[PDB]
Design a protein around this ligand. Sequence first.
Ligand SMILES: NC(=O)c1ccc[n+]([C@@H]2O[C@H](COP(=O)([O-])OP(=O)(O)OC[C@H]3O[C@@H](n4cnc5c(N)ncnc54)[C@H](O)[C@@H]3O)[C@@H](O)[C@H]2O)c1
Length: 255
Amino acid sequence: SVKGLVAVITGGASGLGLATAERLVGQGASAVLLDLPNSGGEAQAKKLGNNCVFAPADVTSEKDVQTALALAKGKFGRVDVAVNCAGIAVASKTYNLKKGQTHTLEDFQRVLDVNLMGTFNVIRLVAGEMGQNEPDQGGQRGVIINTASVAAFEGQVGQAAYSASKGGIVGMTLPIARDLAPIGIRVMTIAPGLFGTPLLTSLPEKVCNFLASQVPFPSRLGDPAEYAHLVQAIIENPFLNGEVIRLDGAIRMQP
RNA sequence: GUAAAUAUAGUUUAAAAACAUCAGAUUGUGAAUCUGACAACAGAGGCUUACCCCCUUAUUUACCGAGAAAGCCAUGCAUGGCUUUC
Ligand SMILES: NC(=O)c1ccc[n+]([C@@H]2O[C@H](COP(=O)([O-])OP(=O)(O)OC[C@H]3O[C@@H](n4cnc5c(N)ncnc54)[C@H](O)[C@@H]3O)[C@@H](O)[C@H]2O)c1
């Protein structure tokens, strides 16, 4: 069970973060949806009930995340789990010879800031918050679960910046786990494949059908409920640490 | 086997369109496109400007011989049986 746990879910107003919040609150936990002010996260928080609260914050801003964690601590008294699901996607080729078009540096920089820098900002602040928790019978003060992508391993054409940020998350998973091992905080990463979230369901139906056919088995877009299930499995297993799990249905992206 | 109808070669409704098909396009999210390929209303034969038919296959449906006239018998003017004629 995860009853009584407090989860800070960044990007918790939509998609994978929303599914994780729904599952965890359904099992009896308390959730803090840390999201952007104009993401409609207050409606989701109210829909989830009393055990869910909304924190309007930008993961790329230290002050916003600090205020969100202060709100979480005041409302629920502590933080046990952190789920970094905030992120943005951008498609852009590094260089197009035919069009003479070059990848803009702003796109790369903002993708980095939102994904990699935002994940690290949340991780460090929430690790500081967890360090105050009395270790349990197993000596654990908390769990941090980051959302990478399979683009961190076989990113496609136009995914240079996205792949850079997700590969950064993958590369920094183990060092942070080693850093926080003395503190008793487990650090894990989930690298989902193609999931039926607003980041993908907004595409034309033919594209969605093709993507579903591209998954070996099951030949469908991943359900966010499956991501939530894997997150809960990581939370409950005390021996999963410093590892990246590919929740992608055995797909390997084509160029 | 013999008469009728019917026959859309990717599909459908019409009497030409819509959906489809093949090749190329590294497409900035209407590519929901652009450049091309294919385009034969079952198959073959004329004949008057135009005026339709004849034939061959394919599918579905139904498939080869007793009228009247007169004389007699039985039943309740009508019916059944028989005899001679065309
Ligand atoms: N959708 C997929 O198929 C897929 C696959 C692999 C990885 N991922 C990653 O999984 C994560 C889950 O996102 P999703 O798929 O649900 O898409 P999503 O857009 O539905 O979820 C992203 C969430 O992050 C929030 N957010 C964005 N920028 C933020 C910021 N600066 N501060 C705070 N909150 C912010 C958004 O408001 C939203 O709630 C993302 O990081 C995504 O890149 C998604």
